[PDB]
Symmetry: D2
Subunit: 276 residues, 4 copies
């Protein structure tokens, strides 16, 4: 019921200078952890369904699991398809009522990225769905080559995405060496592109930086690994202290609770607590 | 879609001398493990939703998770409420379309057990739902006091349950000492009561015995702990060999696969493989 | 979404001295007419699904049609099964989420009426569903024999229904001769039984009387025929003025609008306008 | 459940030389009439939801009403959006799971018609949905100007529609003067375009012609008015013979039955009877 468009949700966050957390879920406990956190914090949230889980559980199943856990949830929730490299898949998530989608054409040429992102964005706008795209390949944890201020402009204008993902120092996974953001590029994009920014790979970015990025117009911070670290630090404590504990409400329940904490941390860091 | 009444499903198993496995699920992977096994084995199955999971996830959520994973499932599935000690809860599961239910009044006097089991059985029959009850307190892992052949008769006649759970040597949890069934009582009940029997606490019963029990009219064997042992032997192998593995598709995916095996084992032991 | 228990809805009406209209629907337009009226009048309402429509369209279909028209409806709606003479049917409507039900055992002996009404009421209370029963056969349009004040008491106490239907001068269909209510019996029942009353066959009762009955504790007034008169006075005006008008949005659309008026009339007469 | 893609359904009809009837529904009875006919005739069918009903009942409601009446239906059904002049509306029907859609750009220039039809067709193909478009304005009941064989080719190639609607002598409504088809154009299109054809305004086309058109590659015949004529010839017989008949199961029930006949007529004429 309290499913809110992602255009609406990112825009509000932007206008009022907070970022919304995009928390990747992989199963039931994780979905619930996320929804519990947000509710306890009176915070709007995005649940992210990404390519990894999609291959395990499936698109449609995972939407339905999220739907199942929304009964006592009064705060704004938006379901987001992450890193879709397929128009069909983008079209599928729309069809089962995702409230936001991201078509990632970063591995395609400028022309082709733009052509498909636009096609998917036209559909999303038609049905009131937040639309994300990416310009600039974001890696996964050796000179340097970031995203142009101009590339961004043209991409944004050509695709009419609601929120733009740029490559700006983040990467996917447990960071080897503390990275550093191009706060400068962010400044320029803020002024040129006049659109909210998405930071991929915010797991492992120092808090200082995150809040600095949110100040330069970042309104969506994706969180995946940090949450799985926490969930796994839970499974472990229990499982390596007592391996003969067979109650999944404890072993994975403690995985959940610890991950619930991690979300609340991030909600606060992003400053959305209070904002429902 | 392929949800089949539990009256129908246990009766067929009984008539044709196999037992259906009642596999307790606690989350998504577990639900899927069960459904994968059954499908690979062309076997009808029961998914059990019991009081423990209900307190974690909820009745309605867990039914909806099962529904979500039924898209590619062609074999007969029945959803079973386990060990309900409440009429309201029994009525709730009916309302969201469980295909079987068990009201456990074993902790109530004969009169009160019968009165409520009957009330719930009247509702279940009305909407074509398999109905289970229990006479005789089944423990959880010191002289002896089993279920009377006559108690059984009166209980069965008074309640009109479809399948009867009797206390006959089983118990809930990791068995301390290899138990032994009253195959004799089973013989008498088979002849007197003329109704299928449910064996609670079949996790840890030697195979020989299980097949012997299925021969004396057991048509439903409940499996919970053994499945969680397996799922936890999975989480562990991965997690204690590599604690920095943060991919839940691996750590809990291997929990799933190992548990998928355990189900298939039991399906075969119970002899339902082939029977869709 | 805005589906409200009928125990809650009739009780509020009772406490605050208004009656809720129970409007029988037979198809889409009729369902919508009812929902449109109520919404325009900020009034809680009951949609009644009765034995006639059930035989045409079915229980489950008609609930789903009502569900389909609830998208823009913000006021309290309750779906009511009317004149069910079957436990199975009563149990079916519960299972697909009716918010009120009536088991009519008026054609059964006191003992049997009470036994089944009680059984159904136990289920309804369990799942928070308004429960209605009837004592005294209400006819369908020649000395006299109404409902006892004492019969009512015992019936009410034995069944624990939320709202009681008594035979008090009403009848089903286009009234041959202006009838007259036993306002006296109503007075006694009000004081003895301490429970809301349902008036069957309020189509064709003079307004004066209706408001008088609502004053003596009637909180539910059933409306069926008057609504079908109106809907048919619509189909006719159009169809007999222009028989070659083939647009169902006009011929049956005007059936709808005229019936929308009739509802609003009744909402006002019953005094629920404003009460959401 | 037995909802079948319209690409699949029209193609089979084409390959095997029958046409599928596209029957416009406006309410419950009409939906049911259609589904009853088809089922009695073991025939695949298309239910059409068009702009008129959409303004009365709404897209999403009408899909849900059709869903509600599909419980006992074993034959192939496809839900078709008719004469959509909006991308948003086309995208909406996809989102609630129509199995076929028609974007009508006949009132747009060649370039713009093609551009939007293509955009919608790309989405439809992505989610396995039959796609229809129109080249050549089809009127609604004075020299002559039909559809070019070449216009058709280019349109078809540019849009990749599954089935093409051409202007070929039909028109919407009660035909003033018996029209005549360009069977010749049909011949040419059959050979050039290699795609199934849709005949709009088949209500009032002599049977001879219909079967002749089906022979030249027409695989979809739209029926609306004839069905409403019949439904209204029903309402009338009853209503003008007895105006004081207030039972909607009779007055509109007889509207239904008569319309059920009309469908069966057409199913046979189109030759789909038997083909499930
Ligand atoms: Zn990313
Ligand atoms: Zn990325
Ligand atoms: Zn047990
Ligand atoms: Zn037990
Ligand atoms: Zn009545
Ligand atoms: Zn009555
Ligand atoms: Zn047309
Ligand atoms: Zn047309």
């Amino acid at each position: 019921m309290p499913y809110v468009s992602g255009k609406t949700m990112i825009q509000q966050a932007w206008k009022h200078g907070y970022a919304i957390g995009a928390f990747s879920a992989h199963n039931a406990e994780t979905v619930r952890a996320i929804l519990l956190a947000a509710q306890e914090e009176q915070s709007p949230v995005m649940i992210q369904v990404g390519q990894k889980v999609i291959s395990v559980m499936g698109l449609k199943p995972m939407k339905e699991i999220i739907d199942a856990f929304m009964h006592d949830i009064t705060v704004p929730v938006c379901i987001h398809l992450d890193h879709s490299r397929s128009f069909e898949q983008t079209m599928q998530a729309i069809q089962c009522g995702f409230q936001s989608v991201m078509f990632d054409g970063s591995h395609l040429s400028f022309e082709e990225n733009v052509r498909i992102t636009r096609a998917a964005s036209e559909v999303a706008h038609a049905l009131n769905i937040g639309m994300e795209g990416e310009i600039g390949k974001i890696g996964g944890t050796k000179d340097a080559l970031i995203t142009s201020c101009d590339e961004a402009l043209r991409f944004s204008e050509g695709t009419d995405v609601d929120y733009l993902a740029v490559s700006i120092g983040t990467a996917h996974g447990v960071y080897k060496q503390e990275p550093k953001l191009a706060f400068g590029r962010l400044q320029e994009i803020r002024e040129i592109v006049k659109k909210p920014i998405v930071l991929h790979g915010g797991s492992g970015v120092p808090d200082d930086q995150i809040r600095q990025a949110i100040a330069l117009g970042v309104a969506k911070v994706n969180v995946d690994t940090e949450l799985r670290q926490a969930f796994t630090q839970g499974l472990c404590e229990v499982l390596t202290n007592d391996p003969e504990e067979y109650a999944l409400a404890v072993s994975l329940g403690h995985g959940r609770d610890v991950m619930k904490e991690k979300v609340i941390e991030k909600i606060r860091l992003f400053g959305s607590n209070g904002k429902a």
